[PDB]
Amino acid sequence: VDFHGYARSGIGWTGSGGEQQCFQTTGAQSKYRLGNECETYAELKLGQEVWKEGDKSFYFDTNVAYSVAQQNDWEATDPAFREANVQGKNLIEWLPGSTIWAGKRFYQRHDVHMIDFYYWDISGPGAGLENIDVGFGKLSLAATRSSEAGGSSSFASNNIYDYTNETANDVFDVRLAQMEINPGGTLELGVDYGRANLRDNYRLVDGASKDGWLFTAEHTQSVLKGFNKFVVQYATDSMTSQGKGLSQGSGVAFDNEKFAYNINNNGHMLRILDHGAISMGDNWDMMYVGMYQDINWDNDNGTKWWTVGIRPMYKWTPIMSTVMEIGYDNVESQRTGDKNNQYKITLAQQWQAGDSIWSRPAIRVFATYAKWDEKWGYDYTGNADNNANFGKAVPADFNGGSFGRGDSDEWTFGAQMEIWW
Amino acid sequence: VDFHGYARSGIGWTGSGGEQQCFQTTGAQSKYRLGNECETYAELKLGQEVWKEGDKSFYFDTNVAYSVAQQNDWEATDPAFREANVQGKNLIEWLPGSTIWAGKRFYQRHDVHMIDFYYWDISGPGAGLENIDVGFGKLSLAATRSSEAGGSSSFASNNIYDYTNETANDVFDVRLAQMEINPGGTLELGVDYGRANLRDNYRLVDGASKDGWLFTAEHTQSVLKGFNKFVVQYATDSMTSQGKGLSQGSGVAFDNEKFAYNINNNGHMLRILDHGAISMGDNWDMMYVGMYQDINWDNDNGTKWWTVGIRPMYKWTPIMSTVMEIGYDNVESQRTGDKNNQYKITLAQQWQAGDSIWSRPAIRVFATYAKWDEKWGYDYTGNADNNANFGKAVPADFNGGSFGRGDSDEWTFGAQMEIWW
Amino acid sequence: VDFHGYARSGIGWTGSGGEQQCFQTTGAQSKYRLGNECETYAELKLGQEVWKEGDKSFYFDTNVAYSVAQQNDWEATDPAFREANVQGKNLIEWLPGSTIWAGKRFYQRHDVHMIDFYYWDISGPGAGLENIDVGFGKLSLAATRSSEAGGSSSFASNNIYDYTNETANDVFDVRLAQMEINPGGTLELGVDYGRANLRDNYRLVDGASKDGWLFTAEHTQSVLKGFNKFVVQYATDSMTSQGKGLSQGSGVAFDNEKFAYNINNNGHMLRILDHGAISMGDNWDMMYVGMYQDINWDNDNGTKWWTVGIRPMYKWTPIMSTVMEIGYDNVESQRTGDKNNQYKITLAQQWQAGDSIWSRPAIRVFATYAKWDEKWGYDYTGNADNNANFGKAVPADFNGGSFGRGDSDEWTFGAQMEIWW
Numbered sequence A, B, C: 001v002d003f004h005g006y007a008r009s010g011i012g013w014t015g016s017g018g019e020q021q022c023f024q025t026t027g028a029q030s031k032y033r034l035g036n037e038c039e040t041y042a043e044l045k046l047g048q049e050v051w052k053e054g055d056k057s058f059y060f061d062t063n064v065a066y067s068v069a070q071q072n073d074w075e076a077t078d079p080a081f082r083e084a085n086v087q088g089k090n091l092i093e094w095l096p097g098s099t100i101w102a103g104k105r106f107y108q109r110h111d112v113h114m115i116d117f118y119y120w121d122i123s124g125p126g127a128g129l130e131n132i133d134v135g136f137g138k139l140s141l142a143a144t145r146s147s148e149a150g151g152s153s154s155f156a157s158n159n160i161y162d163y164t165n166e167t168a169n170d171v172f173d174v175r176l177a178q179m180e181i182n183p184g185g186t187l188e189l190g191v192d193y194g195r196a197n198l199r200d201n202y203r204l205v206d207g208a209s210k211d212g213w214l215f216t217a218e219h220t221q222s223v224l225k226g227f228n229k230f231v232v233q234y235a236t237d238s239m240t241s242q243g244k245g246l247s248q249g250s251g252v253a254f255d256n257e258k259f260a261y262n263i264n265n266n267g268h269m270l271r272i273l274d275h276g277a278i279s280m281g282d283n284w285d286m287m288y289v290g291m292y293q294d295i296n297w298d299n300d301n302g303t304k305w306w307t308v309g310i311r312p313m314y315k316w317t318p319i320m321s322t323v324m325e326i327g328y329d330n331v332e333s334q335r336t337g338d339k340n341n342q343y344k345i346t347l348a349q350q351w352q353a354g355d356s357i358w359s360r361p362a363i364r365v366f367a368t369y370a371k372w373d374e375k376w377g378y379d380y381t382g383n384a385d386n387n388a389n390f391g392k393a394v395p396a397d398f399n400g401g402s403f404g405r406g407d408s409d410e411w412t413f414g415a416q417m418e419i420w421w
Ligand SMILES: OC[C@H]1O[C@H](O[C@H]2[C@H](O)[C@@H](O)[C@@H](O[C@H]3[C@H](O)[C@@H](O)[C@@H](O[C@H]4[C@H](O)[C@@H](O)[C@@H](O[C@H]5[C@H](O)[C@@H](O)[C@@H](O)O[C@@H]5CO)O[C@@H]4CO)O[C@@H]3CO)O[C@@H]2CO)[C@H](O)[C@@H](O)[C@@H]1O
Pocket: A005, A006, A041, A043, A108, A109, A110, A111, A112, A113, A114, A116, A118, A420
């Protein structure tokens, strides 16, 4: 059996008191991870090539994820069964090197490790013909699925609370990669078309976005013994909320009291990303991100986000180093024009199983410091029924309340382990 | 470690709209599976022979099952811990070749693959001396356990709602197999005696069936490079409801509102089955079932069921074929004499890791069509308290209601993977 | 992948009726296990040495525990994710042979197998530098964590129900082992200091113990081809309730109706233990325990406990024996001076994968008999709100009630499997 996975687990403390806390800018879709992760998360994969004849084989892959809080030993939990697929390589003679897979699978996902942000991920139940050689590049085709909690009505109601039927959304993905636009550089182009797929006779809210498009262009350039990727994405409507390739065309959401509400996503998103890792010499490695994300919605509740951070690693020994991370977020409310921001500065001493910034296991002993100043937050007081600004951006002191994290500081510290295998 | 299991996962669509739907005749205990399974189901076994000395060994087996809906990636769930037993082979000198096992285990279960119907399965916590050589055949002995949700009273009440104590049932199984009644044919005979096993001082409802018997005779005939099994079973009372070897002698059931009710099972069941798989030549494989099940209860709510289906596979290549399934169900209400029926016709193009109809992995791309016409359904409207016909067969339009699936059509299609390893 | 674990699963019956029951003296923190365990419990570990260079390696270990009731096959459950750590051996040059680990881990726990009682176990999320060679012995250092359900107030309230915030507790452990105080004998000394660690601005109840100490001294003496351990421990305050190395400094507990209550643990505990296993000749093995535990609390609700039992095994064959266990408990209420006691006498015929009393797998067929007489129990009638003696020791007939198990008998029997691998 093949055994693979990922896991991070550790123990931390808050400078001001109690267990370790993690810091994330309100409105930001990520946080700088080093010395800023507060769960024990783990995926345990058990796969196995079950049949091979010459060039042909059938591979079987699975994945069961756990995520506990790490405040005790016995921590019962509901594991997510995330993957169970079969990939058949070289089964179509006239489409050599290509795979046909079906099942629940993590499909070609793209992410930025240091902020743990996945920008292109349509994983889920699915099927596809992957890696067809089109000569100048490799062409792939997949259809995956997701489904929103409610959003549909068995009959046409004018009352939003009548749209509580789960609504399946379908994504149809087409990618064209490994095109060498230049020397050292490759270009991948992708098109995603998602749409809410209603049961016969069901209806979505009026004005529900219903569908959308995600367009991706990733350029990878080999550099300094590392790489640099430059991404540019553009989403439309129903693809703006999840913003990674998955569709939410119903536009209905529910509060903790099962009350439906209208998170209308018509609009568009523009994402421009640049990240990579470069080795500069023998004693330094460093990863970096820079991103600007603009979710512009028709309802005016979008956000304009900017992040920048670097993680320079200096190797003392082939298995010991000093890692340092510095991140900065700044999110502006579309509805209110206010701005939230934060800068995190972490310093760690680690031991890796390798001389890379990419080598895992890694055992870290760190200290983190964050200082923020948020001038707006979301109004989640009340009920989707009691409240009418429920789920909206609102100023920090709106109606004499407290919204956002405030303007403060904090420092934490602890030991952690991280490993993909 | 040994790694074994089973898994099926896929993505589907409904001709009329939304995700794939599955079709099963109301009153039928199964449905024709090809292109008609709507969950991601998976069992992951991890066993290991932990000790061996010459002829003697101790094998340790486990099984953890998951079953998600496959409408998203992250799907939290409560896995069933189904097996954790130890089998000791050849530990009793004067009973050579025999095993002594104890633990929770799937014990010698018999099923009909294409309708995924298990007709002889007493699996559960248990213990037994398996495979004793009696000369003309192999004799096995096991005792397993199950327990119904409520059914017992701490004191004698006249009120059914007082019977909410879980009631353990015990099965005592004896099988005599591998007897060669003829050439190419073997005969297995089995006797199952189950009984509700009450705590000291507890009482079961009046008229509760309390116990029962299941009698099995299976004849396997080697044929056409395949086999054909002919089964005949007869159950009595408390063994009629589950009808596979497990006992439910309390006769109390609960509605979703915790209301007790009386699902009295005194009566008997007669099952006559014939299924198998035969290869006819080099280009065809085909499995088939034919069954007639008659659950006749004292309360008149039993059913008389008939199924027939065939799954012919024609091999284009050693690893590619066209599978087709055709199934027909027809269940008649004992209480009302009405009839529900359906015919499913599926057509699929698959790729297997083998030239057999039994070879897995298998990746299918299918289209299914079902057309039904049900004239009765069960009355599950209301409450075990509000309703008095609660849980009874009732005509399709009873009291101006709608019971049963109606008289309709539908077609679906999608891609799926199936694999046992 | 490395595959390890533990598992026990079986089927039992109660002499007087229904499934097997287990017997434990009210007030005792354990019971004699042989033929007296009523769950299917299982830990499945999957680890793997992920990197090795010469003397250096990184080992990755995990653990997922299940515990079902074993009254049916399909038994859904919430598995506990208990371990996910990385151990780096020999990574610190000038501290050779030593390990640095971080993650959630079962750390050097001590237990008495036959009563399944862990007397020194601080496992949980943690980190440490283990096995430093101090010359005369090996010195280890670890910090682990636990957290109580509530116990903290966001503001100073006088009302106990205001202390519902989870309160993290930290343990700081230091051990000094493998010191050879004599020939055949080793000495381990340990010091544990635990303390509730409050969020900035939170408050614990008044008089909450807040912290404490656990002091351990274990002497292992090689004897009769076995060992004998003699333990002496002394806890203080917040370490008295769990009494194994974990801290509970808040002193607030909750009833099943979320009502807070005061389980004040100021006081101390004195534990004097002696257990071991010795082989006496070729045909006998025998394990034994003897313990006296005195939890003396300021609130007068502590207990004074005494246990003694032996498990002599006589080998008929290298793989078959007759095991017998005899245990006696006697707990006296601190609050009421009354006494509860019981004696269990079990007799089993087993088959092991070895000629040891320590060899597993093991398949047992047993019969157990217990006879008790309890003169006090805890008052758990009512509510933390309705009741005021809620959670207190109370006489068997207090206020005309029934508290304690009474004065009775019972016998059970069944087959079971046990295995660590
Ligand atoms: O070798 C073929 C392989 O190559 C490439 O994979 C590499 C990635 O491109 C590269 O970025 C890197 O990926 C790492 C990732 O950086 C690292 O962080 C880790 O990812 C973890 C997250 O850290 C963890 O938080 C968790 O995230 C969850 C999240 O909590 C959950 O809410 C939801 O969003 O799902 C996430 C994922 O389940 O899990 C992820 C891992 O699942 O590990 C990544 C790799 O496993 O390194 C990769 C090689 O090691 C290609 O991208 C890939 O397609 C090729 O197959």
